[PDB]
């Protein structure tokens, strides 16, 4: 049975004090629980709702609308690669192929060890330095298919 930790509860409450309607803290509330669980467990949706005083259907709609909010289990280090047009010209396709080979997975799934999850992302606002990828909260620029195997090792 999911139970919000006191720290998570206090974090959501602090966020509620920054807006008129407590509903405005829903997006961050989903991010807090995620930062502590990797994703938003199904039980969290109802718990967050009780804290914000909003229908659980509303909390679920926000989570299933925003892409970064994960409603399905994810690996320890999520890998997001820019698939937009500037990076398409730079050659993200090679980076995607390199990641798929070194990980033996396809965009959208996690590795058997549960260390990495390959997810395509939209523009990362750094096309002058593309191709671009983000592992965890770290940004990597000027990507080359040869550097992929090494970059992944750093995220033990």
């Amino acid at each position: 049975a999911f139970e919000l930790s006191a720290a998570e509860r206090e974090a959501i409450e602090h966020e509620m004090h920054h807006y008129e309607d407590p509903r405005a803290a829903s997006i961050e509330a989903l991010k807090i629980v995620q930062k502590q669980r990797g994703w938003v467990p199904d039980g969290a949706i109802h718990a967050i709702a009780d804290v914000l005083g909003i229908p659980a259907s509303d909390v679920e709609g926000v989570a299933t609308f925003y892409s970064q909010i994960f409603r399905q289990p994810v690996g320890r280090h999520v890998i997001r690669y820019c698939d937009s047009v500037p990076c398409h010209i730079n050659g993200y396709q090679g980076i995607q192929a390199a990641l798929e080979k070194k990980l033996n997975i396809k965009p959208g799934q996690t590795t058997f060890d549960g260390r990495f999850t390959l997810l395509p992302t939209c523009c990362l606002g750094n096309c002058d330095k593309g191709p671009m990828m983000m592992i965890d909260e770290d940004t990597h620029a000027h990507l080359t298919p040869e550097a992929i195997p090494e970059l992944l090792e750093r995220y033990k």
């Binding site: 199904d42 259907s57 679920e60 609308f65 892409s67």
Partner: protein, 907 residues
Amino acid sequence: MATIHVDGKEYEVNGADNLLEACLSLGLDIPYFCWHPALGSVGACRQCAVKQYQNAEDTRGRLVMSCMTPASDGTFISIDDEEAKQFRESVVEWLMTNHPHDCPVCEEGGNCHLQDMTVMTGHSFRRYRFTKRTHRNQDLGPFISHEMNRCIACYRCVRYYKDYADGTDLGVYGAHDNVYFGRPEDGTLESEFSGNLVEICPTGVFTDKTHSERYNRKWDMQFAPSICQQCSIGCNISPGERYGELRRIENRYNGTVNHYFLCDRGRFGYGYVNLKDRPRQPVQRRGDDFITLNAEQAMQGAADILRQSKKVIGIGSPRASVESNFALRELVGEENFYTGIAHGEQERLQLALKVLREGGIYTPALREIESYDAVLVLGEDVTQTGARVALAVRQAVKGKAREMAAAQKVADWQIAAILNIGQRAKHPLFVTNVDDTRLDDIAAWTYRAPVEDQARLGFAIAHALDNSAPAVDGIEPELQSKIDVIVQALAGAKKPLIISGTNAGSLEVIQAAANVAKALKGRGADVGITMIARSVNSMGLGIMGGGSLEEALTELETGRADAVVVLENDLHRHASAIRVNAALAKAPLVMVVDHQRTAIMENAHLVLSAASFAESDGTVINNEGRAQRFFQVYDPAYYDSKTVMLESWRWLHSLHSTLLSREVDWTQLDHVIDAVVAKIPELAGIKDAAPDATFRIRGQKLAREPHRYSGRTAMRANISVHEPRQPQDIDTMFTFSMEGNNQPTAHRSQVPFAWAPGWNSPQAWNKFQDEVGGKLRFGDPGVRLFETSENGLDYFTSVPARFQPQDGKWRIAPYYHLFGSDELSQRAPVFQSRMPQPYIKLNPADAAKLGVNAGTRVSFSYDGNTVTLPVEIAEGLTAGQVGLPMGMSGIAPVLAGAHLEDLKEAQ
């Protein structure tokens, strides 16, 4: 108000409306989906596109959405512009790209708005060659089925369920083209108004499971204008039949009452009509032998015993019609006619009537309730007794946003803007009950207290609004502070609304509400008073009057009465079963006229097979005093010729004739109605409730079957290849066939069903109304029996004393359930799952004192009978009080206000 120019032709429309609403009300046809006459305009599907020109010289205009565009003066628009037509067809094509090929196996076929618009847009050729998106469905309970594949993302369900009905379990999930509409998880929709989704959804995602079991297409349904019989609100319905079984109940638009929405009890609580244990032929009990008689034999034999009876008394029912109750009254005599209701229930019902008929305060109609700016509910759990009034109260509370938006000059149809301007701002609402209520979410305050304390609050509010009102003693300072907020809210209101009823089981709560309303009237306010009764014709029986069930039993008990003719009443819901059974066993003759198999029938000497609302015609009076007529949907003897199910008034009228002339007289309904208006002047409006049987439209009777009804020469071929003769109707203006009139422009007010060429969906009501969302073109059906009196009643000076817990005695608090409290609806099988499991509710402290916990079975004695029930913990319930499910078989509604004695842990 404003002059618009559509396709050259000039039209006068209301500038306050949108072009879609305006043009639809002009008879012009514009395809649409996201817009609903009650949910406002959002501009999502982009289907109502119309070309708009800046002036009369503009030849290159722009495509705008008619639903999101004001019908301003000097507006030049074209619906037939080629670009507009092409765009409107393209919108349908985009919706058809991912649409499933399941017309033959979907329950909206022939009643689907999407099918109607595809054809209206003239889109019959597919160019898309790619894959269609799929979605897995969910379980939504026992009434609504889910088929997300058939969705078009118009957002109507979420806007109705959440923004209108204030539900919290339906939502929109996902993004882009993977948008999903359903519950956050599999489970039963919790809204008491979830059924309206079946008519709101323009596709077949939400459907009626109660019908899906025995599903039939709309063109094969025999429909009749009827009034719902599950509570006292009197909503107009369109019951439909096929093969001799009630298949589905649809909403009949009454711009004065239910408009476009019904509640779950009335929409899914009709299965009792299709029970196979119902009486179908007259039966006589000779010792242990049962003999099926015919109508003629039954009348002769019964009249023979009645002719030699010392005193024949008659017991009526709030379920029976005005005509049926009157027929029994004439058969047994007014002095020997008894209302089958408990003394207390009758006192409360008569007090409620006196307030509405002699209080000098206007009683609002269901739709008018949505226009009050402050509401006080005293003791009435409306959501569970008059659900549709609770929906109306919700719309009234949302008025603050509408007022705030009007100040910013925002159009009334722009719902999104109105909601943003409003935020969590709402009109003042205060509810009082013995425990939690479903209206607590939108209520400013909920007073949970014993019925006596709830009444004291009313007397207190009245004294504060007018010192001349009786004052109350013992109000604690804390409560007084809360009372002041209510007083200022009602005092500050321009159109206050006081709502009470007889379901609380207290005469004082009705008197308190009368005092509060009188106080506001004295302060020169547009105050409104609403009283919620218990059954379809409770107010009608109240106006007619009669002795109580207790007095009727005493007659049979002293032996002064030898014959008792009971009419559509089980008697066990109004009196002790031990007393009723014993009293009925001392009567030489006991005749029961009911359409359902009741317990009292077991020891009845004769049982007359009466018809239900579906197989009968009559008049019922709602809580507001509106007399509405219901019409027979189908002939019960069409398929089974042996069936002899006759209307109760016809049975009783014929018996009275056989008793006086030894001859049977199956009269017409109009004759019985004329008798009621002549004998009872109070029930005189019932004559104008509906036209007589001689009414015709250009010589044509009104029709009950659609013009494409099928199976005429094969539906009864199994019984006989020789087609039977069309059942004939001498009681109403409706024909039991399609050879009649159902034109949207027919000068009538009773519409059996809504169909117009091109509009096969419920959206066809638009063509039967003066203005879309308004009233029926030639007036809404129904007549209010009484008008607001010139003078009012004196303040009631009887303030009760505060409730005091008494060791041993346990005050029974009334808990009502939309699913379970009503008698006939509980008989319906689909309701078994929705109905609550048996329970007794106790204050946490009282449970600790009795050393019992949740689930513990407890034994208690009422009428010399030990009953065991699982204990449920109710924190809101005050100590000294026990909670029982009123109406649930065993717990008679009369138990409200009574006391349990030996309450202890069972075994």
